[PDB]
């Protein structure tokens, strides 16, 4: 989607495996602001919005 009117996918009640997204070299950047990028698998949240 466009930046003005983007897509918001609600993800919940599933296993949020972040080890693939983190390790993947296809990304130009992967940066976190409140939670270390290597602890994402251990922190269990109520909701993630993509």
């Amino acid at each position: 989607a466009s930046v003005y009117a983007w897509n918001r996918k609600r993800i919940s009640n599933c296993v949020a495996d972040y080890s693939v997204l983190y390790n993947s070299a296809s990304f130009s950047t992967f940066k976190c602001y409140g939670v270390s990028p290597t602890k994402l698998n251990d922190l269990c949240f109520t909701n993630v919005y993509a």
Partner: peptide
């Protein structure tokens, strides 16, 4: 807000519905 979704006289059907800690 659809924050959750899940999909799975001759008779008596008993049920208990309780809500604890969410």
């Amino acid at each position: 807000n659809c924050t959750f979704e899940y999909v799975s006289f001759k008779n008596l059907r008993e049920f208990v519905f309780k809500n604890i800690d969410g």
